[PDB]
């Protein structure tokens, strides 16, 4: 099995995360962990059992928490699935998530080809 070094993963994958941060306004709800009380959505953790956001993913890349590229992809997709689950289809967060998912799919594919 291929062993991926933490810096190899950071070099390959961090640009794909940056591409999501670069989306404005669409990344704005995703740049920090959800704070349900501050945001006035106290039911959030009743619906979303495994929160995830861009800042948490960035920290995981920085601190070598991913052994394999697919673990990174899984966390980005967790973030998207949380948003599509929690938010109504008409909402900004839902539509913004849909755009980030388009951007991410485009960015991640050539990078995954390069890592194999
Ligand atoms: C990921 C999580 N985000 C929110 C949600 C609902 C309300 C506010 C937020 C939220 O992130 N608020 C902080 C950003 C404030 N703000 C910044 C400008 C764009 C924008 C768009 C939609 C909702 C909020 C918003 N739903 C969620 O699933």
Curated annotation (Swiss-Prot):
It is found in: Cytoplasm; Nucleus. Residues 81-99 are annotated as: Interaction with ASF1A. Disulfide bonds: none annotated. Changing residue 45 to A: Impairs binding to acetylated histones. Methylation of the KIX domain by CARM1 blocks association with CREB. This results in the blockade of CREB signaling, and in activation of apoptotic response. Residues 4-111 form the Bromo domain. Residues 43-89 are annotated as: Interaction with histone. It is linked to Chromosomal aberrations involving CREBBP may be a cause of acute myeloid leukemias. Translocation t(8;16)(p11;p13) with KAT6A; translocation t(11;16)(q23;p13.3) with KMT2A/MLL1; translocation t(10;16)(q22;p13) with KAT6B. KAT6A-CREBBP may induce leukemia by inhibiting RUNX1-mediated transcription. Found in a complex containing NCOA2; NCOA3; IKKA; IKKB and IKBKG. Probably part of a complex with HIF1A and EP300. Interacts with GATA1; the interaction results in acetylation and enhancement of transcriptional activity of GATA1. Interacts with MAF and ZCCHC12. Interacts with DAXX; the interaction is dependent on CBP sumoylation and results in suppression of the transcriptional activity via recruitment of HDAC2 to DAXX. Interacts with phosphorylated CREB1. Interacts with CITED4 (C-terminal region). Interacts (via the TAZ-type 1 domain) with HIF1A. Acetylates histones, giving a specific tag for transcriptional activation. Mediates acetylation of histone H3 at 'Lys-18' and 'Lys-27' (H3K18ac and H3K27ac, respectively). Also acetylates non-histone proteins, like DDX21, FBL, IRF2, MAFG, NCOA3, POLR1E/PAF53 and FOXO1. Binds specifically to phosphorylated CREB and enhances its transcriptional activity toward cAMP-responsive genes. Acts as a coactivator of ALX1. Acts as a circadian transcriptional coactivator which enhances the activity of the circadian transcriptional activators: NPAS2-BMAL1 and CLOCK-BMAL1 heterodimers. The KIX domain mediates binding to HIV-1 Tat. This is CREB-binding protein. The lineage of its organism: Eukaryota, Metazoa, Chordata, Craniata, Vertebrata. The gene is CREBBP.
